[PDB]
Design a protein around this ligand. Sequence first.
Ligand SMILES: [Zn+2]
Lengths: 48, 218, 61, 275
Amino acid sequence: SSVMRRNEQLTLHDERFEKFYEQYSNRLQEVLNDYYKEKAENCVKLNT
Amino acid sequence: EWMPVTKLGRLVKDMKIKSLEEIYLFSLPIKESEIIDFFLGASLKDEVLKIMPVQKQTRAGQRTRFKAFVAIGDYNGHVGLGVKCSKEVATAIRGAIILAKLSIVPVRRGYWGNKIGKPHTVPCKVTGRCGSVLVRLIPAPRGTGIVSAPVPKKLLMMAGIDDCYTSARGCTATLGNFAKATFDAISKTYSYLTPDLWKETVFTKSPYQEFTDHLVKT
Amino acid sequence: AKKRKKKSYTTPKKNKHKRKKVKLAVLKYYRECPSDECGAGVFMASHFDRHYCGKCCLTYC
Amino acid sequence: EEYVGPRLSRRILQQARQQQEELEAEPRVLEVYRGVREVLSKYRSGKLPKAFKIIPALSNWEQILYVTEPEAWTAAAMYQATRIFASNLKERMAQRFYNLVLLPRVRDDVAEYKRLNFHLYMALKKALFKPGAWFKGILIPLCESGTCTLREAIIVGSIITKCSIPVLHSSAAMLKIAEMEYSGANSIFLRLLLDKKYALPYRVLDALVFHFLGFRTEKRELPVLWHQCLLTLVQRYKADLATDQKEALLELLRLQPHPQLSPEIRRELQSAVPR
RNA sequence: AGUGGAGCCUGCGGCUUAAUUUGACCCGGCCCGGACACGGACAGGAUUGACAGAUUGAUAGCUCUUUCUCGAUUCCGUGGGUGGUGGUGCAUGGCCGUUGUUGGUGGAGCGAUUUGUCUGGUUAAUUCCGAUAACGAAC
Ligand SMILES: [Zn+2]
């Protein structure tokens, strides 16, 4: 904190500083099988 | 740091030789500039007359060097004139300053009419000659100033001459000849014999013979 | 130096696509996602056949 | 010739030994993440595998990320990863990603190519889509490092000038800049934050005045960037300077003058209305 | 022994070509392209992200159905005596480590210039032996 200060005429906001300096499964298997399906689907070699 | 080589320099480095005039009395060569730095010092002003760049013919072609004409002079006393050609302008200027300092001659100053006060003008009309350039100095009254061309104007003001009428003949446009001619005239100021200098000379012992015992130790 | 003329050559770039604006879409909410983090708050969007998530993209039938 | 040589004599001795001897005789997710690791090493465009897009939803995301080898990624892949991590909240996680992956790449290639790539420029803009993780993650760490150069300063500050910043976040960044020890690149960021011309919290103004007044007794010669930062401060915020601070700034100008910029600052300070 | 003659290959000119990149090129197509000021819209959402299916030469959530979430991190026009992740020229400074050519001094000439840097022998050589108004040096 410094010495000389705002003197007069109002404060609109107080400002929040104590958050800056004071700072310092099934779904994955489904995504896996979707990935394997798409990786097999770039060339299928079977469909007629 | 100055370490003298000549005997005259070794005497000047000590307090054996008191004035420059003693060295002028026995007509001895001054072969170190540090003697002139010792005796005159801060009195010595130096004025660059001219720098001309020149082209030396080399086996590689032509390459540039510089030629500096420098007049050095203690006012109310002494001057010298030096010319040096060298590779850069700064080294040419300091070389010409040294080579002008090694040529310092005294000038005799006299009176125009009545002998009241200090001498101000040349004692008698003198003449200096260099390669078709002829420069004549004529005594002038007090307050008349140096009436001359700018290059001898500088050299005569540096000599401590206050006032002089001048006359120049020949190719005065070549500057080294013109400067050397006016330097010759102001040397012939003391080479001239007047009735003031008619008493028989007494011969005082030379510094080489006066201080032989001091030069034994070196 | 020598200055250039700065040719004009107007080419209209005003026709650029913007996605459609749906106004006051909070009418139609009142399926809930039973997820690990986005439960009880997020509404679970409907196709013609199947409802898809808008935060975690889970797969159903 | 008097000596045989190495190789021929080696063959001769082996031959003689042989002749003497013969006369004497008579889990599974690891493979997926490794595969998409080779994919991201050569990515140019197009859609990413869905295994890459569910990384911020994972619990052990860091181990997956070291498997994906972010230091070997390409610029388009890093831009899309920045977009993915900015899309899925968790400001601490985004801050740690910017600390670990993004800013090391930017510091590495600005020092190498002397200019920033297009994709990484849009990557810092997309990282600025979440500003709190940016300020605590890249800007304040870059300023706290002390090794930030001028070109990094100009690039990142230009990214700051392009975007509209929240006033509270901008003010906190300005205060953390102001209390920090001086570096030559620091005044560039401070100036580009003052160019935003937001309403300024007064404690930040006091810190700025104290910082510039802490430059009062310094014998170090200052660059023109410091003078221009001070000129911006005076030009935009002369209305809320106290007379004590005003005279202190004039004293600072008297002690640390510039032939060109200092009279202009004196003109702006002498023509200022308060409140 | 060849090459230069012959078939093939390669380079450089030349010729064709949309391009035949150069002492990266061609044909199409999507995307967006600054701050600041002014005028609009935004909390009666600004905008991001988005699974499926249809598209055009492309698995374009950078478009349509699905508009679901994301809570300002704003985007739409009007703007230039405006420009900055620009280009270029000038000026000056930071990081390791040390304390055959021509000068200097002397001799010659007003000077440009000269002598040094040379009769003879010798060497690749102002090298060397040595003669000498020159003597001593650095690269
Ligand atoms: Zn979804």
